[PDB]
Symmetry: D2
Subunit: 255 residues, 4 copies
């Protein structure tokens, strides 16, 4: 994976613990040029400090809230003008109201359910449609998911249904975009201590279970997700699309 002269757009860095920052560090080590997208300024002022650790010679930062078509459209349009054609997108965006991530799934509000779907699933479709405009020779799109999209996990609740939806999103996009030579895949990350992970009910109990039961008997980290993102974003994975790669210490394969 030498990624010199590759350009990747990385969506969803909030702080130094975000899974996308592990992705970022890894691609940065391999010589890629990185463009970053963020939702609010609390991530901008902060992103800017995090980018000091990378060897990125310049900060390419764009505000995009994936709840707005116009921000996704105008965003990717600006990126093309500032930076040219890209080679891929790392999508690491998700959201649910805290109230819907604990206690009873059956009590989920319509508003909260549709919000999770909007941000955590639909946002890949629109990102992919707009990013394709910048990948005329082909490219690669990767989304983060979690095992709770495939099994019912205590507490994860509405996010589990949004992830299930994201994983299908990835397959329907793989089928659509395949003839344009754009591969679309998911990385199912094991549990990692992030900002968003404070929102999930019973998180520490998740970590400990991994350590006890997963084949490798340890948890994974951001850099391990990034190393697999690197394979997926590069030519190493050229025959692989519509795939879900579990980077979770083997936990997915046991019961």
């Amino acid at each position: 994976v030498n990624l010199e002269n590759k350009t990747y757009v990385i969506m969803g860095i909030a702080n130094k613990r975000s899974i996308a920052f592990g992705v970022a560090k890894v691609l940065d080590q391999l010589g890629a040029k990185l463009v970053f997208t963020y939702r609010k300024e609390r991530s901008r002022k902060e992103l800017e400090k995090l980018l000091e650790q990378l060897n990125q010679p310049e900060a390419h930062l764009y505000q995009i809230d994936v709840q707005s078509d116009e921000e996704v459209i105008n965003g990717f349009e600006q990126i093309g003008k500032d930076v040219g054609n890209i080679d891929g997108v790392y999508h690491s965006i998700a959201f649910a109201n805290m109230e819907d991530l604990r206690g009873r799934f059956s009590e989920t509000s319509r508003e909260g359910f549709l919000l999770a779907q909007d941000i955590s699933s639909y946002s890949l479709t629109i990102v992919a449609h707009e990013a394709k405009k910048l990948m005329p020779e082909g490219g690669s799109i990767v989304a983060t998911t979690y095992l709770g999209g495939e099994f019912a996990v205590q507490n994860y609740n509405v996010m589990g249904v949004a992830k299930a939806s994201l994983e299908a999103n990835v397959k329907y996009l793989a089928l659509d975009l395949g003839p344009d030579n754009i591969r679309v895949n998911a990385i199912s990350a094991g549990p990692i201590r992030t900002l968003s992970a404070k929102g999930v009910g019973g998180f520490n109990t998740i970590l400990k279970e991994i350590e006890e039961r997963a084949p490798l008997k340890r948890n994974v980290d951001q850099v391990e997700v990034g190393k697999t993102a690197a394979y997926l974003l590069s030519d190493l994975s050229s025959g692989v699309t519509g795939e879900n790669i579990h980077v979770d210490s083997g936990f997915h394969a046991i019961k």
Copy 2:
């Protein structure tokens, strides 16, 4: 499988070809009391005509548009007062705009995507929550899905992401309502000529492929979906929950 002194709510009959009317003939044949819900006054009219084919001595009909919290909430509450406690719900409800059921999935609109999720997946969650109120003793809830929820199938597009969502919805509901003795399951029906089928591009091609490639080499019909629904709604399936049963001539198991 005798269902005398059982009561089931069937959601989603629009005409004689509906999958839900297959369920109805089977449950009615086995002695159950049925309650029907519908959206369009056209569907109530068809129901009044089709009830003359059933053994149901009286017509129990409720207009419930599942897009309205109020209509579902007041619909079940009313059902409870008219017939008392129920034994299960057969959910056979789905919708997507025609624009979003052909050509390119990467071009799906936000509005088109959330609309399919709202009707086709979330409706199950809110229906279960209100139906739980009429099943103090336990009961059984069954929803209708398609293979396109598990694989990217051509043209099914926004509905496939909706069915993936529905199937996860079934697992999360299974987990949450299990301790209340309420089973939640899914029938994955093979292609059947219905009104809604008319909006799926390539639908004749799908039928023909079943005949040629599925293990049984024949299509299924609505009564066959009904017969598995009887199994799922009844004590026969008492240790079965969170499950997806493919009533599709074996098609899911081949490639």
Copy 3:
């Protein structure tokens, strides 16, 4: 589901706790004629005793060790001569050495691995081939599997790989016999205290993990598997083949 004038062959009753005896009580309650096959002379003796609590007017019992082609061939030929044509077969047969079962999977012996395949998987293929001659107009064949065929489960070792083989065997048989109108399916039973459970290390802790985690929060029993077998063996499941129905309180659906 009424089964008068039907004839089913049941393989693998050793005693009252056997899963197949649960199948037998259910089919007997439903009016089926039953034929029983056994390996050890002790199982024939338990069978002559267990028959007293069934409605079967005649004991039809046949020694068939599935390690021997000639016993399977001669045994079904003789069944056809004594009772005529049959409507299906319940296969409830598996075996592995303690010595392979009990200690690291990577240390499994060739002879142990192949023995477990032979009895636990290949036996389905030869039985189906011989049973099909007694089903000129179609019928149904059900085999018993366990979740450890789909995931790596602690201690289940060589038998996990044999159940993975057995579930593939079901699909390949489904595809092959589908055009003769013979359906082939699997029941994934949850854990149940039987004579064979005593070969699974940590059985007690598996039982307890179901009660704590399975959506239904309780273990299943042999009758529950029999009620799902009745469904699969009867015309209720007519559009169902190549399927794997989990009768495990929803445990397959959670992580």
Copy 4:
């Protein structure tokens, strides 16, 4: 992915079309030391000739017929004395009798069934057990499987059941070898013209179906499998075990 100072054992090159020779070319290009195992004289001769395309400063060739324990034990032991500790194994070994790769599954002989299991699935267990001795520090083991192990595919028959078994073998090995920091994974390759493909009935038809229907609308090749093998054998995938990566142009995601 720089593989200098790694040593890998590659099992099952027979000629220039073998999937393992695509693996070899990639690993060799990345700086790895390679050790090759073979069964037939003819294969050792092709290997001698194919080594001239590689940069291997020496030929490390070992006759290992995986039907014999003594050969696998003595093979790896010899390898350990000649090259020292290794970093992993690529397993590219399968076999079935021709008559078992076409026509009707139900007619498979016991001898042919167990022969396919022995060579194509059990071999991984014994090889893992022996290779583990040369990986005190950790390492990576990769097997080659086919989608026919997950679904029933016309003509693949007894090899479909042997791959179902291989894929479970990979999960059970992962669970067992995980605490020794040994990862075990599979690549599910799409169809590729090789010597062994000539035994798969309808092979050309399978290839055309990929071009027509798979997301990427083109077939894969041996080098593309080898690039994924590089990812699995290397530290890029340090968090990935018990996984099955489909290198098949997305065909696994579609129905």
